[PDB]
Each structure stands twice: as structure tokens, then as C-alpha cells.
Amino acid sequence: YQGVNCTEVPVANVFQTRAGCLIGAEHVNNSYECDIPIGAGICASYQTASQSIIAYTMSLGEENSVAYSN
Amino acid sequence: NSIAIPTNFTISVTTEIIPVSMQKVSVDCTMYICGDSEECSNLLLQYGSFCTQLNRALHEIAVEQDKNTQEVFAQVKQIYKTPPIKDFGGFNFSQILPDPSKPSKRSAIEDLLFNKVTLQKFNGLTVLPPLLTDEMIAAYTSALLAGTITAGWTFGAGAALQIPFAMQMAYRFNGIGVTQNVLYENQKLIANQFNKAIGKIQDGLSSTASALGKLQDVVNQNAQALNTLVKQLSSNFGAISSVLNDILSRLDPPEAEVQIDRLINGRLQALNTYVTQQLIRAAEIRASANLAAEKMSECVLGQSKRVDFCGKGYHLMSFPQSAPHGVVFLHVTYVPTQYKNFTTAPAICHNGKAHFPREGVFVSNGTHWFVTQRNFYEPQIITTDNTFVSGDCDVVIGIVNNTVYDPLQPELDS
Amino acid sequence: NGLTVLPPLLTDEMIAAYTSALLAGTITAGWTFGAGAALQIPFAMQMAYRFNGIGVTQNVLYENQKLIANQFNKAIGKIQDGLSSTASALGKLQDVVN
Amino acid sequence: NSIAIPTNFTISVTTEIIPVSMQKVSVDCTMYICGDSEECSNLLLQYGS
Amino acid sequence: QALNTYVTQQLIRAAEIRASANLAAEKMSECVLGQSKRVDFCGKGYHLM
Ligand SMILES: *[C@@H]1O[C@H](CO)[C@@H](O[C@@H]2O[C@H](CO)[C@@H](O[C@@H]3O[C@H](CO[C@H]4O[C@H](CO)[C@@H](O)[C@H](O)[C@@H]4O)[C@@H](O)[C@H](O[C@H]4O[C@H](CO)[C@@H](O)[C@H](O)[C@@H]4O)[C@@H]3O)[C@H](O)[C@H]2NC(C)=O)[C@H](O)[C@H]1NC(C)=O
Ligand SMILES: *[C@@H]1O[C@H](CO)[C@@H](O[C@@H]2O[C@H](CO)[C@@H](O[C@@H]3O[C@H](CO)[C@@H](O)[C@H](O)[C@@H]3O)[C@H](O)[C@H]2NC(C)=O)[C@H](O)[C@H]1NC(C)=O
Ligand SMILES: *[C@@H]1O[C@H](CO)[C@@H](O[C@@H]2O[C@H](CO)[C@@H](O)[C@H](O)[C@H]2NC(C)=O)[C@H](O)[C@H]1NC(C)=O
Ligand SMILES: *[C@@H]1O[C@H](CO)[C@@H](O[C@@H]2O[C@H](CO)[C@@H](O)[C@H](O)[C@H]2NC(C)=O)[C@H](O)[C@H]1NC(C)=O
Ligand SMILES: *[C@@H]1O[C@H](CO)[C@@H](O[C@@H]2O[C@H](CO)[C@@H](O)[C@H](O)[C@H]2NC(C)=O)[C@H](O)[C@H]1NC(C)=O
Ligand SMILES: *[C@@H]1O[C@H](CO)[C@@H](O)[C@H](O)[C@H]1NC(C)=O
Ligand SMILES: *[C@@H]1O[C@H](CO)[C@@H](O)[C@H](O)[C@H]1NC(C)=O
Ligand SMILES: *[C@@H]1O[C@H](CO)[C@@H](O)[C@H](O)[C@H]1NC(C)=O
Ligand SMILES: *[C@@H]1O[C@H](CO)[C@@H](O)[C@H](O)[C@H]1NC(C)=O
């Protein structure tokens, strides 16, 4: 539900994001690439265990540690 | 018969601003046209599928905005970190690299740029947030900058080791036809000039607040379009009133339907005009974003030979900075100064042969003739190694009597 | 009644002056156009530099100068005659006007 | 194992034409739509901006 | 309605003219003031001036 907070959504598995409130998604605090965009850096995907939603913050890539010699 | 060759140069840094994205808007046609009136909805149902086309067009525009941003920024596969060392050979990057202590990971210049543009209407009108937050954009920009500075010409090659900055500068100097020894002999002066230019840019940004007009224009145009669309509701278009409830509670159905139809036609026309103008503006913004992406690719990741594509002068390098709905480029160029006059010639006439320089021009101050590069004064004694022999002393117009020397014989007879 | 045409900000005399200034600068200053300079570089030197720019030694120009100049003048004259003869060359602007 | 190398050349000059600017036009809406009739202007006053 | 149609057509033509003017400015900068190495961007063949 875009642009509303779910304190009043039952009138017309809950989790409040910056794009609204998401229903039926399993929140995780890992980071992967985006499969289905949502908004405000949040992206969703289907991974298994049954194939359920996981809602995660977007990841910009993998770190590269180049050594330091002059 | 004369020529001027520079004996000095300077380092200039200039700014460029390019808008990239645009605000995303979603509109519910039914609520705007016949809001909270089911009879008005039934009357509108006779018009078919007008609202769906506008909704689809707006959705396409919204998708295109995120596509533009992704095309412009997400070009680097990995994320590089700020080098813990600050041994850049005297060059200063503290004002551009992110501050580890600040809560937000911007830099001073980025903070100034964001502060420079600090300056309801919800009726069925909604604004959707962008897919990428400003923090992610800043992270992408910082990763690009750090990777470029650390790697040089081995940026996108996976495993890499820190290439010294002075070697990159020497390579870039070789790019424009200046021998690398000039940098190795004027490192301190070049670094001082670069730092002074960066400080001058920071002061200029902190002084005036009218430098972001290109983005301000886009913001103002979108705001004015939305303001006109909102203000269009108060018109009656020749009907009895501009309130549906007044028509319902004042007139009988057979002509109240006529008044409602009049209002519906007017509001539909307004919506169509707004959508068309938004489409045209979005096309223009997409063209600008494509230009910005091309400039990023051809300037940040390499040295450009196109004239006046990276500011005035010979391009050396450039650095990107984030901005609200746009980017900022800092082009570093090379500008020769302090020209001095000299006397030149096209060829040197030896004992029956003609000599042309391999790379450079023949110059003289009245007595001695030298061969030197074209964009910096550095004379050398004329030698058979520096020249190239072809033809005789007859066809060349303006040939000059002189002597070509060879150091092989003095060593041979010694 | 309602339709009116406003004049351009820059008169065509100014545009011609700008074009002439650009042409004179690029024909006199050579590769020092924009900086201080303020002296005339010989034209043959610029021609030799640009000949070297496309991977051809300068001796070729320095030995064929007369023929090169004659060919350039003949090409300019041919372009002038072709412009003076055919009247259907500026369709790109004619279409916009139409 | 055969190659071809030119032994002569020529100098050519061509032409290129690019439009730059259009024609500036200004239109008075009230005069065009309801010219010289004040009743028509009064009726048009309800149509907005 | 006629006025609206005319204005929209003029806007599209203006966009096209602006693109052409940008191309002309790029050509001036890259050809008059320097030697271009892009193939067939500044005539057919090797470019001189
Ligand atoms: C080139 O690179 C060198 C390092 O190799 C930099 O040297 C130091 O740079 C830092 C950051 O630019 C300087 O720190 C700043 O100094 C300002 C003035 O300091 C004088 O005045 C204050 C009075 O408040 C005294 O306390 C201080 O001792 C000095 O006498 C301060 O005003 C700055 O404070 C602001 O920024 C900091 C973040 O750095 C914030 O946390 C503060 O709240 C405040 O907003 C800051 O402290 C430092 O002085 C430089 N030292 C030397 C020896 O140069 C060069 O700055 C750098 N040059 C360029 C052009 O990039
Ligand atoms: C490359 O090709 C061109 C054209 O095919 C050659 O130009 C020709 O050059 C010769 C001698 O260099 C010219 O002959 C001379 O003609 C003049 C005028 O008629 C005459 O007075 C001289 O006595 C001599 O006979 C010839 O005219 C000229 N062609 C034309 C059309 O003018 C050029 O020589 C070729 N380059 C090389 C290196 O062979
Ligand atoms: C969604 O909207 C509701 C509106 O009531 C928010 O509830 C209050 O929000 C304010 C600030 O927006 C807080 O100061 C109050 O403490 C909130 N009320 C309570 C009882 O806590 C709600 O916070 C909004 N959701 C989010 C995530 O901000
Ligand atoms: C170009 O001109 C500058 C003048 O600004 C020269 O800078 C001087 O350099 C010498 C030694 O390199 C110093 O002793 C002076 O103090 C410098 N003057 C200033 C004002 O900084 C610079 O050397 C010149 N370039 C070359 C290659 O000589
Ligand atoms: C300096 O220029 C003169 C031209 O006046 C050259 O003199 C000729 O030299 C050739 C052989 O080098 C002789 O065959 C001619 O008879 C000379 N002519 C005259 C009028 O003296 C002279 O060679 C040139 N000197 C150098 C070092 O190039
Ligand atoms: C995610 O958050 C919960 C509670 O905030 C925490 O218990 C859990 O350890 C976090 N996940 C990871 C991988 O740290
Ligand atoms: C420098 O040489 C130019 C010729 O290129 C001449 O006009 C000028 O007077 C000379 N200046 C000095 C100071 O010799
Ligand atoms: C010309 O320059 C050279 C090298 O600097 C010098 O040896 C010679 O004396 C100079 N000639 C005059 C007339 O100053
Ligand atoms: C410069 O012009 C004079 C005559 O005006 C001429 O004698 C001289 O040869 C020319 N310079 C060159 C390098 O040919």
C-alpha cells in the first residue's frame, strides 16, 4: 500500500517501510542484488522451505581491497 | 617568418552541471475528474478508456526516470574504499573525498551543492520516491572517484595495486604532447596551483547561490505545471457552478447531467494537456541524461582528445560530484602562458641535403638554431639524431643555411 | 490580428562579423588561437602540421606546395560555380521555412 | 601476399548545411479567439488560464 | 482547439531544431578549432581543416 502507514490499512506479516506498509513479506537484514524493485532502496525476491518473500535493503556490489604501496 | 612558443603554463579547474532525473508523478483520473461522486463516475463511464492511457503514460515516465539514473550512475562493478594513506605526492583531495566522521557520507562540496537548492495539492495527485536514495548515489560517486584515483589505467581489471599518482599525471602529460620530465621537475608548483584552484572553486560555491539554475529551472517548471493543474479545478467552463454537490442539490437530473458533462469535458482537456507537456519534457530530460552518461564515460574513465568537450584547453582528468537530480563535473585542463617570439624556418640546408625535424619546430634567437616541442620552450642542439633527411636543397621554399652535427665522430677519433 | 513575428536578437551583420572573426583567427593564429600569441604563424607550417596529423610526412607538402595550392583553388572555384548554377541546394532550410 | 599503395593523391572540398534557428512568433489569445467582441471575452473569462 | 494543436506542433518542431543546433555547435567546436579523427564526421576521407 503506497504512501500510507498500516496503523489504518485494515479499514480498507506486516512491516512498515519508507514506501508504505508491506503485507506478506519476511523481513531480513542481509543484503543482495535487486530482483523486484519496490522503492527507497528496498527490493524483494523469492527464495526458499517454501518459496516466500524476503524484503531486504539493496546492495551496491562487493568490496575490493586494493593494497597500498607508493 | 616568426613563431611564438609558450614558456609557462597554468592549471585551471572548471565546473559543469547537467540535469539527469525528474520528479515522478502518479495521478488517479477518476478521483480528479469525478471525485466522491458515483453518478459522475457513471457519466464518465460513457467515455470509455481515457484514464487508463494517461495512467500508462505516467507510469512509463516514472520507469524511465529510474532507468536514466541507473544508466548514468551504476557503471562500476565493485565498491572501492577511501585509501587510508594521504601520500598523493602533494595533491589534496580532502575537500572531495567523503569525511569519515560526518553522519552523512557526502563531502564539503557535495554538502554545499545540496544546501544551494534548499528552496499540499494532494487531490488525487501523488509523488513517488526514487528507487535509489541520495546515500546510494553518493556511495557510487565516491567508489568511482576512489577507484579512479587509486588505480589509474588498471581501474576495471579486478586484481590491482595502488599506482602512484605522479605516474598517472606523467601519463596524462604525455597524452597532450608534453614530455613527462616537466611534471617531475615542477611537481610542487603544479600541486600548489591545483590546490589553489580547488580552494577558489570552493569559495565561489560558498559565495553565490545562483549557480544551480539548470536544476532550478526543471524544479520550477514541474512545480508550475502542477500548480496550473491544481488551479484548473476552480473553473466552471460555462456551467452553473464548479461544485458537483451544488448542481445535484440545485437542478433536476436532465440538465444537471449536462452541466456535469461540461465539467467532465473541461477537466479531461486539462489532464490531457498536462500529460502531453510532461511527455515532451521527459523526452528532453532523457536526451540530457544520455549526454551526461556519455560525458561520464568519456571523461572520468579516460582522457579525451575531442576539442572543447571537457572545458577549454587540453584535458587532463575530471572528477564527478553528486547533486539533486543531476551531476557536477570538475574538469582539470592545461593552459599555456607567457609566449615569447622566435624566428623559425621549415628546413635546414646541409651540404647538398635537406633536414626536417622528427617532431618539433626549428627555432633560433638570432645566432643558434634549435629544435623544440610546440607547446613548451625547451631547446636542444641540432643533431643528426633529431632530424630526418630527404631530398635536396632546391625544392624547399625558405630553406636556411646551417650545419647538422654528429657526436659519433668525436668519440670515434678519441 | 493576434499573430506577430519578433525580430532576432542578433542581426545577420553581427553573425557575419562573428564568422569572419573566427575565420581570420583560425587562418592567422594557427594553433595559438585563444592565447596571447598576437603574431602570424606561416600558413605552410599549419598545413605541414595537419599533414603530419594524418600520418603523412611534411616533406610531401614542402615539395608539392604549388600543386596543392592549385588544386585547392580549383576546388574552391568549382564549389563557387556549382553554387551559382544549381538553385536546389538549400532545401534543408527551405523545408523549415515552408 | 599482395598489397596496394597509392602513389598520388588529390585535395577535395565539400559542403555541409545545418539549420540552427526557427522563426519567433507571438500570439494574443484573446484577440484571436474573441476579437473586438466584449461578450465573447466575458464568456471566455470562465475558461481559466 | 486549433490554437492548442498549433502550439503543440510548434513545441515538437522546437525540440527538433534545438537538437540540430546542438549538433551544429559540436561540429563547429570539433572541426573549425581543431582536427578531428572521427571517421566521416568532418567530411569523407582524412580531415585537414
Ligand atoms: C590540504 O591538505 C592538508 C592536510 O594534508 C589540510 O590541512 C588541514 O586541513 C584541515 C581540514 O581542511 C584543517 O582543519 C580545518 O581548519 C579550519 C581552520 O583552522 C584554524 O582555525 C581554528 C579555529 O576554529 C583553529 O582551531 C585551528 O587550530 C586552526 O588554527 C577550521 O575552521 C576547520 O573546522 C571546520 O571543519 C571541521 C572538519 O575538518 C569541522 O569538524 C568543524 O566543525 C569546522 O566546521 C577545520 O578544523 C586544518 O587546519 C589543516 N591544517 C593544516 C596544517 O593545513 C589542508 O586544509 C588541505 N587544503 C586544502 C585546500 O584542501
Ligand atoms: C599526380 O597526378 C596529377 C594529375 O594526374 C599529376 O599532375 C600532372 O603533373 C604533370 C607534371 O608534374 C603536369 O605536366 C606539366 O603540365 C604543364 C601544364 O600543362 C606543362 O607546362 C609542363 O611542361 C608539364 O607537362 C600535368 O599537367 C599535371 N596534370 C594536370 C591535369 O595538370 C601529378 O604530376 C601526379 N603526381 C606525380 C608525383 O606524378
Ligand atoms: C504513520 O502515521 C501515523 C499517524 O498517526 C504515525 O503515528 C504517529 O506519528 C508521529 C510522527 O509521524 C509520532 O510522533 C507518533 O509517536 C506516532 N504515534 C504513535 C502512537 O506512536 C506513525 O508513526 C507513522 N509511521 C511511521 C513509520 O512514521
Ligand atoms: C612560470 O611562472 C611562475 C611565476 O608565477 C614561476 O614561478 C616561480 O618559480 C621560481 C622557481 O621555479 C620561484 O623561485 C619563484 O618564486 C616562482 N614565482 C612565483 C610567483 O611563484 C615558474 O617557475 C614559471 N615556470 C617555469 C617553468 O619556470
Ligand atoms: C649556403 O648557401 C649558398 C647559396 O648561396 C650555398 O652555395 C652553393 O653551394 C653549392 C654546394 O654546397 C655549390 O655547388 C654552389 O656553387 C654554391 N653557390 C654559391 C652561389 O656559392 C652554400 O653551399 C650554402 N652553405 C651551406 C653550408 O649550406
Ligand atoms: C536482524 O535483526 C534482528 C533484530 O533486530 C537480530 O536479532 C538479528 O541478529 C539481525 N540479523 C543479523 C544477520 O544480524
Ligand atoms: C616579437 O616578435 C614579433 C614578431 O613575431 C614582433 O612583432 C615583436 O615586436 C617582437 N617583440 C619583441 C619585444 O622583440
Ligand atoms: C641564443 O641562445 C643560445 C642558447 O641559449 C646562446 O648560446 C646564444 O648566445 C644566444 N644568442 C644570443 C644572440 O643571445
Ligand atoms: C616571408 O616573406 C618574405 C617576403 O615578404 C619572403 O622573402 C620570405 O621568404 C618569407 N618567409 C619564408 C620563411 O619564406
Numbering used by the authors:
A (entry chain B): 612 to 623, 641 to 676, 688 to 709
B (entry chain C): 710 to 828, 853 to 1147
C (entry chain A): 856 to 953
D (entry chain A): 710 to 758
E (entry chain A): 1002 to 1050
Reported in the publication:
The S glycoprotein is composed of S1 and S2 subunits that mediate host-cell attachment to initiate virus-cell fusion. The S1 subunit comprises the N-terminal domain (NTD) and the receptor binding domain (RBD) with subdomains SD1 and SD2 undergoing hinge-like motions that promote RBD movement between closed and opened conformations. Engagement of the RBD open conformation with human angiotensin-converting enzyme 2 receptor (hACE2) triggers a large-scale conformational rearrangement in the S2 domain, which contains the fusion machinery necessary to mediate viral fusion and infectivity. S2D14, which contains 20 computationally designed mutations within the S2 domain and a rationally engineered D614G mutation in the SD2 domain, has an ~11-fold increase in protein yield and retains RBD antigenicity.
To better understand the molecular basis for the improved breadth and immunogenicity of S2D14, a more extensive cryo-EM dataset was collected for high-resolution structural analysis using a Titan Krios 300-kV electron microscope. Cryo–electron microscopy structures reveal a mixture of populations in various RBD conformational states. (B) The cryo-EM structure of S2D14 in the two-RBD open conformations (3.1-Å resolution) was the dominant population and represents 43% of total particles. Although this final class most closely aligned to the one-RBD open mask used during focused classification, two of the RBDs lacked clear density suggesting a state with two dynamic RBDs, each sampling an RBD open state, yet distinguishable from the two-RBD open structure. Together, these conformations reveal that ~66% of particles contain at least two RBDs in the open or exposed states and are consistent with binding to hACE2 and CR3022. Docking of Fabs S309 (64), S2X259, or S2K146 (25, 26) onto S2D14 confirms that neutralization-sensitive RBD epitopes, in particular those exposed only in an RBD open state (recognized by S2X259 and S2K146), are accessible with no apparent clashes. (E) Docking of Fabs of S309 (left), S2X259 (center), and S2K146 (right) onto S2D14 in the two-RBD open conformation confirms the accessibility of these broadly neutralizing RBD epitopes. The 23 total mutations (20 PROSS designed mutations, D614G, K986P, and V987P) present in S2D14 are all well resolved with clear side chain densities. Analysis of the structures provides molecular details for the three main types of mutations incorporated by the evolutionary consensus design: (i) improvement of complementary electrostatic potential between interprotomer contact regions, (ii) optimization of hydrophobicity and van der Waals (VDW) contacts, and/or (iii) introduction of hydrogen bond interactions. For example, the mutation T998N introduces a hydrogen bond between the asparagine oxygen with the side chain of Y756, located on the same protomer, while the mutation T1027E within the CH forms a hydrogen bonding network between the E1027 side chain and R1039 of an adjacent S protomer.
